[PDB]
């Protein structure tokens, strides 16, 4: 049940980033509307700048945590599938890769990491046995639709807001810009 709520929060901050993009685009369209007019005053121009840079930093970090939440939910679902499907049918996997398994079970650290390397190459061969083979596949059977709505590849806007990243000092100064933005909103 944790995967479902994690997925729900993933769409929650996804939609948050979308609406942040919408209010950003509103900021630039208002900016261009004022630019196309007569710019007698520059204080409005300066505050429009301040807000558009602070909001673009905000949507940058929004895309960032949306991306990491997407990977988090993907890996938690993958590990849950591995755990329970092996709970169902792990005896065949055990009998298949037995040598390094007994190498791991009753031996020391050097033997264990050598066994990890052996199992790594063996499972790489096992995966490439069927990976190059051409077979139709379906999405995650437990949450197929749930995985189709989230999508494996994120939206192009996600990397549009992830292409540019500011320095940590610049990141904190945009954070303080967001703080003063909320301060003037309180005014």
């Amino acid at each position: 049940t944790a995967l479902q709520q994690a997925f729900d929060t993933c769409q929650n901050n996804k939609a948050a980033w979308l609406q942040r993009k919408n209010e950003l685009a509103a900021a630039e369209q208002e900016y261009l509307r004022l630019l196309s007019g007569e710019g007698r005053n520059v204080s409005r121009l300066d505050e429009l700048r301040n807000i558009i840079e602070v909001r673009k930093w905000q949507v940058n970090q929004a895309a960032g945590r949306y991306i990491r939440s997407h990977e988090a939910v993907q890996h938690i679902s993958i590990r849950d599938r591995l755990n329970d499907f092996m709970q169902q049918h792990g005896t065949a996997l055990a009998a298949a890769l037995a040598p390094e398994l007994m190498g791991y079970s009753e031996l020391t650290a050097i033997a264990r990491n050598c066994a990890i390397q052996r199992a790594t190459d063996a499972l790489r061969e096992a995966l490439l046995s069927w990976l190059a083979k051409g077979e139709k596949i379906n999405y995650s059977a437990q949450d197929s639709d749930i995985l189709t709505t989230i999508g494996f590849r994120p939206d192009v806007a996600s990397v549009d807001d992830s292409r540019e990243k500011f320095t940590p000092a610049q990141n904190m100064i945009f954070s303080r810009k967001s703080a003063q933005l909320a301060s003037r909103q309180s005014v």
Binding site: N50, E53, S183, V187
Partner: protein, 209 residues
């Protein structure tokens, strides 16, 4: 200050400007200045933008030195150490109100006029303001004005006044222009900026030239 310059100020700018001269005693300057600053703070209390111009900090400092009584303890150079707090009363009103309005002050300073007591007040007022502008005599000998010594000029947390990326842009320009001389920098800046109409075009031709 001489009445001719203050009357030129009166006749030039549309806004009203207060005046004082050597005819007015030092205590008169102190009291008119404190009404002026108190009125400015009362006005900015009503969420309004107020700007004050000071010419100069040394003249007022001399006036406050003259008017202060002797408290029994004297800072080196025959000046009352406590009295120095009173020019800071006329300078401490500079603050921006986040709820609305803001009070700003722009003050000039005078040094190297043959008086021993002028540079040290600048030294003890160095940390008072968040930005400063230097004027040098070698540019005056060079006869070209303004004698803006912007190479050593600096502001504390000026980022709040400009954007972010374009802030790093003029800082790139600043540290590019730092190593060269203070003179040729200002001539070629004013030469590039002279025949143009807006500073934005200056910004693009810094990416063009």
């Amino acid at each position: 200050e001489r009445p001719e310059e203050v009357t030129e100020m009166q006749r030039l700018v549309k806004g009203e400007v207060v005046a004082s001269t050597f005819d007015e005693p030092a205590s008169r300057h102190v009291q008119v200045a404190e009404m002026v600053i108190e009125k400015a703070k009362r006005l900015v209390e009503h969420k309004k933008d107020v700007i004050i111009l000071l010419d100069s900090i040394t003249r007022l400092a001399r006036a406050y030195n003259t008017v202060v009584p002797a408290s029994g303890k004297v800072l080196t150079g025959g000046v009352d150490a406590n009295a120095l707090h009173r020019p800071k009363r006329f300078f401490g009103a500079a603050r921006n109100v986040e709820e609305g309005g803001s009070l700003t002050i722009i003050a000039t300073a005078l040094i190297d006029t043959g008086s021993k007591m002028d540079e040290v007040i600048y030294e003890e007022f160095k940390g008072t303001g968040n930005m400063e502008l230097h004027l040098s005599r070698k540019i005056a000998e060079k006869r070209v004005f303004p004698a803006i010594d912007y190479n050593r000029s600096g502001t504390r947390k000026e980022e709040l006044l400009t954007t972010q990326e374009e802030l790093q842009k003029m800082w790139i320009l600043r540290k590019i222009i730092h190593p060269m001389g203070e003179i040729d920098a200002m001539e070629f800046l004013i030469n590039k900026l002279a025949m143009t109409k807006t500073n934005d075009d200056f910004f693009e031709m810094m990416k063009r030239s």
